[PDB]
Amino acid sequence: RALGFLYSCYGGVSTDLPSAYLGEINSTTDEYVLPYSWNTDGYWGAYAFNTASSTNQDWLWGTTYQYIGQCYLFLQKLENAIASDAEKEQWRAECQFLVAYYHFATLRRYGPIPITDSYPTSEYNGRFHFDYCVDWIANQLDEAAKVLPANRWGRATSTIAKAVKARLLLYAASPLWNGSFPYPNWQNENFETPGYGKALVSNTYDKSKWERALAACQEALTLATTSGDRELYDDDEYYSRQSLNLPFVPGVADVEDNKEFLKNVMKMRYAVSTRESEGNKEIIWGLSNQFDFYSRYPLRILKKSDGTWHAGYSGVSPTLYTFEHFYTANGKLPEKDLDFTPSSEWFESAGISSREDIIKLNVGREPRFYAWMAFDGGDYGTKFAAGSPLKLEMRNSEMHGYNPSLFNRDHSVTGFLTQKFVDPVTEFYTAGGSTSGTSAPTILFRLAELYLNVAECHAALGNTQEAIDALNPVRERAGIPKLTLADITNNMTIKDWVHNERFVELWNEGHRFFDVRRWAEGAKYFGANKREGLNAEVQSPTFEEFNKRTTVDAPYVWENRMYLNPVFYNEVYKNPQMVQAPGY
Ligand SMILES: [Ca+2]
């Protein structure tokens, strides 16, 4: 009975699930767009188009605080009763972690929040100052970490607790919360935070926040890679064990000299789509909860024997920003790489026989690019179409292109697709039915992020070589060159490198939403007309008219109120100590 209640306390951790295509943390960034006509599904549209409001929103807050309540209730049921002292202590530590985590999941969306330290309206807490919240949550995580095991329904570990504290302190040190908050006059009305009066957010840069984040990110990384038994996924032969062909990559043929590159492509596909039982020791916190794959599949996949088609929805549509910020094979940005095609020629055909639709921008790229992206003329998957890779025809309205007559008008907005998280063994059958190979946990925390977090902290503190040394394990694993001091220039700073490595490595893992926000760069990356793609919403285009830089045509905008999630109007009314977020 007790375990059942305990298990139920974990029920809210799938809130804001990474990679779920209708979720606003996933489908509102510059990573990829969804068809405008899909805006009637879910909340992504409201958030991307700034129509979310106090009366139109994802009331995430209702869920987190409900499960926080369950945690405290469990602790009470325990006190009134079963299990050893040691086991009861573990249960209490799991609840402590969960309460802290639920506050963090709320904080990262809403900003300053009520701290609920236990289960009349005048006694209601309003928001506490952001820095108060950070301190309280961090302490709670440290306390739970003392008790929890470093390694083991994925139950809490000290490793996870320290990883959450690391990300929390990284966020707290970031511009939004450490000197660049765009509403300096926003404060409480008649609620006070101990030590902060009515203030809600710091308006002054504090270097010590970066020193504290570095210490936490370092401690999390060491714990994960020692007692936590974590290491970067580096198996490069699983494709062979599953009897799969090496993938087709334009410009990198399957020849002896290119075997390492092609194996790195498959390693990256498996890195984010495998279980610990399959040899993956990189995941720190993963959930059983799955997310939809059909939204990223191409339209027509395979014609069945009865004459109907296996079909995807083809809606997850990577931007030109994504296709321009994954690296070249030399580990540089395409625009900055002196050996790469000049941008004036990016949209020309690469001239590959039988695959003339492949443009030059898509040749000469890093293994992560071919692992996770897909494009006109290229392959999608490995066993996808009854045992063979699927060749994409993004300009053919009778295969993978835009077609206004298709039910629901599913299509790629940009002319590109992603295959990240797609199991290489995924296969659709002529006789009907299909397989997606072996499911994998949805990643909340994995070890690559801890390296990137340490790099960002070093960069902020001016420790250039140390930042480089934290990035290079991730770069090497992905099969691009290591960084050296010679690579750090006015044109491409250590911070530029850290932010871009994060963009690439953690692409579509629910980070970009938060990172652009904490960097206070909403206008720069999420603003009107920033999102671009090919000319992909014209039926049956020529190669020439298809491959033109085209602004994504939907009401995307950035205004500063969008840094924070608005509070449900009823919560603002129900709680007299509660203030609405700025601009809402
Ligand atoms: Ca798998």
Side-chain angles (χ1 to χ4, degrees), residues 294 297-302 309-313 428:
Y294 279 88
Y297 297 157
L299 292 171
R300 295 224 249 210
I301 298 170
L302 180 77
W309 285 83
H310 290 291
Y313 313 152
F428 292 82

Side-chain angles (χ1 to χ4, degrees), residues 119-428:
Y119 184 80
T121 192
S122 61
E123 290 199 71
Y124 292 177
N125 287 343
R127 306 172 185 256
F128 289 106
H129 190 290
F130 190 90
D131 293 356
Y132 183 102
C133 295
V134 168
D135 275 346
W136 186 88
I137 299 166
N139 175 62
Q140 291 294 314
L141 293 162
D142 280 333
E143 284 189 2
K146 294 176 185 167
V147 172
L148 299 168
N151 192 27
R152 295 181 178 270
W153 192 16
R155 291 168 73 174
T157 58
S158 60
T159 301
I160 295 168
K162 293 283 179 179
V164 172
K165 172 182 175 184
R167 186 189 296 173
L168 167 71
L169 292 188
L170 172 64
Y171 283 15
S174 297
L176 185 65
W177 301 119
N178 192 13
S180 296
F181 190 68
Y183 300 100
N185 302 295
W186 185 54
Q187 59 190 351
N188 272 318
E189 292 177 350
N190 288 279
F191 183 73
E192 293 211 330
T193 304
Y196 294 89
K198 293 178 175 64
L200 278 178
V201 188
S202 174
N203 301 127
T204 308
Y205 174 71
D206 178 354
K207 187 190 189 190
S208 80
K209 288 183 174 179
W210 278 114
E211 298 169 336
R212 285 201 305 285
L214 179 59
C217 292
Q218 287 176 320
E219 184 168 281
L221 179 59
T222 288
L223 175 59
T225 62
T226 55
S227 304
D229 197 31
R230 306 296 75 192
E231 70 189 338
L232 295 172
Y233 184 81
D234 205 36
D235 189 348
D236 62 15
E237 294 183 7
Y238 198 14
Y239 80 100
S240 182
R241 298 199 296 279
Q242 304 205 291
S243 293
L244 301 182
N245 292 325
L246 288 171
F248 168 78
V249 175
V252 187
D254 192 335
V255 301
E256 186 178 288
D257 286 352
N258 292 340
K259 201 186 186 181
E260 172 165 49
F261 186 105
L262 299 176
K263 283 161 68 177
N264 282 331
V265 171
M266 298 300 295
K267 178 165 66 182
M268 293 315 310
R269 290 193 178 161
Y270 281 115
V272 295
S273 62
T274 51
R275 305 171 185 188
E276 180 124 18
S277 69
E278 296 171 286
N280 196 331
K281 302 172 67 179
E282 182 169 345
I283 305 310
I284 289 169
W285 196 8
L287 305 187
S288 66
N289 309 62
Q290 300 292 287
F291 52 86
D292 166 74
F293 289 107
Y294 279 88
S295 49
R296 74 192 43 221
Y297 297 157
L299 292 171
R300 295 224 249 210
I301 298 170
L302 180 77
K303 189 184 187 61
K304 294 182 268 185
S305 287
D306 63 38
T308 66
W309 285 83
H310 290 291
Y313 313 152
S314 183
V316 181
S317 311
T319 54
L320 271 166
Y321 183 92
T322 287
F323 268 55
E324 290 176 26
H325 286 81
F326 270 59
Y327 297 115
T328 65
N330 298 321
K332 300 170 182 172
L333 290 177
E335 208 154 65
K336 294 178 185 298
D337 188 338
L338 297 177
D339 296 321
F340 193 73
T341 310
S343 61
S344 60
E345 301 172 352
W346 283 354
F347 300 97
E348 298 178 353
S349 167
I352 302 169
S353 187
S354 76
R355 295 185 184 259
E356 288 82 359
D357 284 326
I358 298 175
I359 58 171
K360 292 178 178 174
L361 174 61
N362 294 338
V363 182
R365 307 301 290 277
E366 65 170 323
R368 280 178 293 197
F369 176 82
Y370 300 107
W372 296 340
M373 306 298 154
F375 41 81
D376 198 24
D379 280 352
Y380 193 100
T382 289
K383 302 301 281 263
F384 218 70
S388 294
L390 176 60
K391 187 192 177 176
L392 294 180
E393 304 169 55
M394 302 295 293
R395 304 191 293 106
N396 180 358
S397 68
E398 305 308 311
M399 285 296 299
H400 304 134
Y402 179 66
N403 188 329
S405 70
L406 298 196
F407 187 96
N408 202 41
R409 297 203 170 100
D410 295 335
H411 69 283
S412 166
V413 176
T414 60
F416 302 135
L417 296 176
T418 182
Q419 52 188 317
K420 193 174 179 172
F421 310 118
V422 176
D423 194 312
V425 173
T426 300
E427 178 174 356
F428 292 82

